[PDB]
Write a structure and sequence with these properties.
This protein is mainly β. Helix content is 0%, strand content 50%. It has a two-stranded antiparallel ribbon. β1 and β2 form a beta hairpin. The chain is rod-shaped and about 30 Å long. Microbicidal activity. Active against E.coli, Listeria monocytogenes and C.albicans, in vitro. It is found in: Secreted.
């Protein structure tokens, strides 16, 4: 429920 994941683009990632 809600949201929780880390996106990875190029050579850097980010959470929420």
């Amino acid at each position: 429920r809600g949201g929780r994941l880390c996106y990875c683009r190029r050579r850097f990632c980010v959470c929420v």
